[PDB]
Amino acid sequence: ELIKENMHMKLYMEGTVNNHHFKCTSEGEGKPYEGTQTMRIKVVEGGPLPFAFDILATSFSRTFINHTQGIPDFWKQSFPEGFTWERVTTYEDGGVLTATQDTSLQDGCLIYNVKLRGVNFPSNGPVMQKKTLGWEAATEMLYPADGGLEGRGDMALKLVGGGHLICNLKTTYRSKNPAKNLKMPGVYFVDHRLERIKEADKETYVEQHEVAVARYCDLPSKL
């Protein structure tokens, strides 16, 4: 209702990965009911990053998920209070990245605040050595649990020369107005495709774009 067919977003991000501190800001906009959005991102502190930008990718936008087939939109329903999420992402080579996000709506702009911490990335692994080429498409599984909804899913990070490094994502999404009576969904899925459209100055400017669609499992249930 407060989320209009086209919405702009502003974002602030602070983190430390493997003792390196940085800050990012970004702005962009999208079409919340299409499930599309574009972000223009600048590393404004600690640039250039001595680690692959790719690991920050998923920490810049849950409002912009096309809900098909009438799945209740956990995130769009949380306005005007908005929502938060917290994630732990675990790379199969030991890197661990925790991230917290607050999402709000002020004067019709979507505003994101992110804090994150990355530790234990191997010094000679592809993340610290920046040998990564973007994310494969991915599906996330979502389901009602404790505070709100949890998401689970793996993502494949592309490696130069081919190969992938896998990580696993565990997310808790919380509505800020807990009192608000939600229509909660059952168990479902969000298909995500997140792509880097452009970059500059050693990944110190990055244009990222994402399509995300919510769906049930479209298979017969002999039960």
CATH architecture designation:
Beta Barrel
* CATH class descriptor: Mainly Beta
**CATH superfamily assignment?**
Green fluorescent protein
Report the structural category: mainly beta
Rg calc:
17 Å
Annotated CATH topology: Green Fluorescent Protein
Q: How many domain units?
A: 1
Number of helices: 0
Broad shape: globular
String of helices and strands: EEEEEEEEEEEEE
Q: Helix share of residues?
A: under 10%
Distance between the termini: 37 Å
Spatial order of the strands forming the largest sheet? 1-2-3-13-12-9-10-11-5-6-7
How many β strands by DSSP? Answer: 13
**Estimated share of beta-strand residues:** over 45%
Biggest beta sheet summary: 11 strands, mixed, barrel
PDB class: fluorescent protein
Keywords: beta barrel, fluorescent protein, light induced reversible photoswitching, reversibly photoswitchable fluorescent protein, cis-trans isomerization
Assembly: monomeric
Entry title: Crystal structure of monomeric reversibly photoswitchable red fluorescent protein rsTagRFP in the ON state
